[PDB]
Design a protein around this ligand. Structure first.
Ligand code: HEM
Ligand code: VGJ
Ligand code: CA
Length: 426
């Protein structure tokens, strides 16, 4: 299409990045383009598989102690499967948890079992493979309407993939599951965007705004919950207010935190898998060709490889409950430990040809949904289906859809985000 992005050779390894150029506790490092980032993690995996880092500043948050970065696959996996040692309390981002933040962000993702499991059971039936298989009809026609409207909205055949499809599809689905009405979708989207875009001047850099948005979304969850308290609807919000996770009902804060976890995770995750997928297809059109020629035959492995490639969630943090030594590095009880999924997903000792984007890759033990165990992504089956249906609807309405500019990238250490990706089609 000649308006298109330049092609790229598949299996191209990243630039050489000297260790002296790697500074994970600087925001400027997260600004560097993706190739240099991948290069920097390659250097770490080889020369400092476990290394220590001061935690990033950014206004209004509390950096506190630094963290031991696990950049190897086997260590990320080991840490995920040993939660007695690598605890999710008190926080799964690198910054210290505060009681003010805990009002909105003290959900089960920052708790250990047995309380974590008891909370998780409240909503987990809805995310089961049997059940996500049953909402294919809702997914399909949100996706189909979005691709149609992408076409109708754009006589020029020039659109932003992010706001026209990748963004609103996983948003509409999670809000529908929560029971959030249509008129509120956009406001919800703008809130989770600021929550998980903090540090990026296109999203927010003033902590006052972050606190306001948090309060607004917490206030919003509370009002919806209270509604559902009196009038059951058959949405996840009703399950939340009806639950006893205990022999006790959930507190306001527990409801607010659970609501915000679902909606943020639902809104700031699969949209990036989808946008990175389209970009990757734009760079490697042989891959686009193979998949379009055999959509259903290649879909299971295509969807996993888009997730491996995008690694939408860059890292999660844990905290040691006891001393432990790994790979010859002694770490102490109370130390922060960060699990770099984006690095595990390029690990030369687990993946042949880690730099090759291969929609037929089989097996594909990636850690895009984390390393397995107690906090395994609750939305994994939902996300896979969202991804599959989105590309299915593109393949059938605009099969040659293709990026026309490099993406505007989210400045973020936690989320491999794309803010906008101009695409074209014929
Ligand atoms: C490609 C899309 C997605 C990716 C890559 C992803 C990634 C992750 C990762 C890395 C974790 C932490 C896992 C661990 O600690 O071992 C997680 C947890 C979680 N995710 Fe997903 N996520 C995605 C989509 C979604 C969706 C659509 C939802 C729907 C609400 C969702 C809901 C959750 C929840 C609730 C948790 C916490 C589970 C728990 O603490 O037990 N995710 N996700
Ligand atoms: C599956 C994933 C994407 C769900 C994560 C959802 C929950 C709501 C994460 C909490 C987000 C926190 C409060 C944002 C702060 C991160 C940042 C400021 C850390 C730092 O200072 O370096
Ligand atoms: Ca347009």
């Amino acid at each position: 299409l000649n308006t298109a992005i330049a092609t790229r050779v598949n299996g191209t390894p990243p630039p050489e990045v000297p260790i002296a150029d790697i500074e994970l506790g600087s925001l400027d490092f997260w600004a560097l383009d993706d190739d240099v980032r991948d290069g920097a993690f390659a250097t770490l995996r080889r020369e400092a598989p476990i290394s220590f880092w001061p935690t990033i500043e950014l206004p209004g948050f509390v950096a506190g102690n630094g963290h031991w970065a696990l950049t190897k696959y086997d260590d990320v996996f080991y840490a995920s499967r040993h939660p007695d040692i690598f605890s999710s309390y008190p926080n799964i981002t690198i910054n210290d948890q505060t009681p003010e933040l805990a009002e909105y962000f003290g959900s089960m993702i920052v708790l250990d079992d047995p309380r974590h499991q008891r909370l998780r059971s409240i909503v987990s039936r809805a995310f089961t493979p049997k059940v996500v298989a049953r909402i294919e009809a809702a997914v399909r026609d949100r996706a189909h309407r979005l691709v149609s409207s992408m076409i109708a909205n754009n006589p020029d055949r020039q659109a932003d993939l992010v706001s026209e499809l990748a963004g609103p599809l996983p948003l509409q689905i999670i809000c529908d599951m929560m029971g959030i009405p249509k008129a509120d979708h956009q406001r919800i989207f703008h809130w989770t965007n600021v929550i998980l875009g903090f540090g990026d001047p296109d999203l927010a850099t003033d902590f006052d705004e972050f606190m306001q948005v948090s309060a607004d979304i917490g206030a919003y969850a509370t009002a919806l919950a209270e509604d559902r308290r009196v009038n059951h609807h058959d949405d996840l919000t009703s399950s939340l207010v009806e639950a006893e996770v205990d022999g006790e009902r959930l507190s306001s804060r527990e409801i607010a935190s659970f609501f915000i976890l679902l909606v943020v995770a639902g809104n700031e995750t699969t949209r990036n898998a989808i946008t990175h997928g389209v970009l990757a297809l734009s760079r490697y059109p042989e891959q686009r060709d193979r998949w379009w020629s055999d959509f259903d035959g290649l879909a299971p492995t295509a969807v996993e490889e888009i997730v491996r490639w995008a690694s939408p969630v860059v890292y999660m943090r844990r905290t040691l409950t006891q001393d432990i030594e790994l790979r010859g590095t002694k770490m102490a009880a109370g130390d922060k430990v960060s699990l770099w999924y984006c690095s595990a997903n390029r690990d030369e000792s687990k993946f042949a040809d880690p730099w090759t984007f291969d929609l037929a890759r089989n097996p594909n033990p990636h850690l895009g949904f984390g390393g397995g165990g107690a906090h395994f992504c609750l939305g994994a089956n939902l996300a896979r289906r969202e991804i599959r249906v989105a590309f299915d609807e593109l393949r059938r309405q605009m099969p040659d859809v293709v990026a026309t500019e490099e993406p505007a990238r989210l400045l973020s250490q936690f989320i491999h985000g794309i803010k906008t990706l101009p695409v074209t089609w014929s």
